[PDB]
Design a protein around this ligand. Structure first.
Ligand SMILES: O=C1CC[C@@H](c2cccs2)N1Nc1ncnc2[nH]c(Cl)cc12
Length: 167
């Protein structure tokens, strides 16, 4: 039993809700919140910009130190950093950005990072400003993640479309 509330159950381990991941994180304080990161951990917009703003820029400060030490992430890769006031940990995961020409096959590799964590609150990877089809992202998620994932979808119209078209 965990503290997530109001989710539709898609599969044994994947749950979905129309919710702002920022507000959801602030309420649940999950062990792991997933960020829709880029390789530079520059949290300018989208989910990343929103999560960082909610930390009063502390996520960005921590991230800049991480990059200065380790260099950029790989597309499809991840790193674990602090969750600040939102969660215990933030798993920064880099899905391919279609608006940069990156290979969509790397979306499966990106979701594989979730399997290192028993329970996660997460957005759909590569959706939104990353330019991929969110329906496809949901399919890859369901077919790749085996741990318990609670997906927050900000846009209500998109949420209804994902549910109604889910196989
Ligand atoms: O709903 C969705 C679906 C895909 C993703 C994207 C939208 C546009 C580009 S990628 N997306 N976005 C969010 N998902 C959860 N919480 C959020 N909070 C804010 Cl702010 C935005 C947001």
């Amino acid at each position: 039993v965990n503290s997530f509330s109001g989710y539709l159950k898609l599969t044994d381990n994947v749950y979905i809700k129309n919710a702002d991941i920022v507000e959801e994180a602030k309420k649940v304080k999950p062990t792991v919140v997933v960020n829709a990161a880029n390789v530079y951990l520059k949290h300018g917009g989208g989910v990343a910009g929103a999560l960082n703003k909610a930390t009063n820029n502390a996520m960005q400060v921590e991230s800049d130190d991480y990059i200065a030490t380790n260099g950029p992430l790989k597309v499809g890769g991840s790193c674990v950093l602090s969750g600040h006031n939102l969660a215990k940990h933030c798993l920064h995961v880099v899905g391919p950005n279609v608006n940069k020409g990156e290979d969509i096959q790397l979306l499966k590799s990106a979701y594989e990072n979730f399997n290192q964590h028993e329970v996660l609150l997460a957005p759909l990877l590569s959706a939104g400003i990353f330019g991929a089809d969110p329906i496809h992202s949901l399919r890859v998620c369901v077919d790749t993640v085996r741990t318990n994932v609670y997906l927050a979808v900000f846009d209500k119209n998109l949420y209804d479309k994902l549910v109604s078209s889910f196989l």
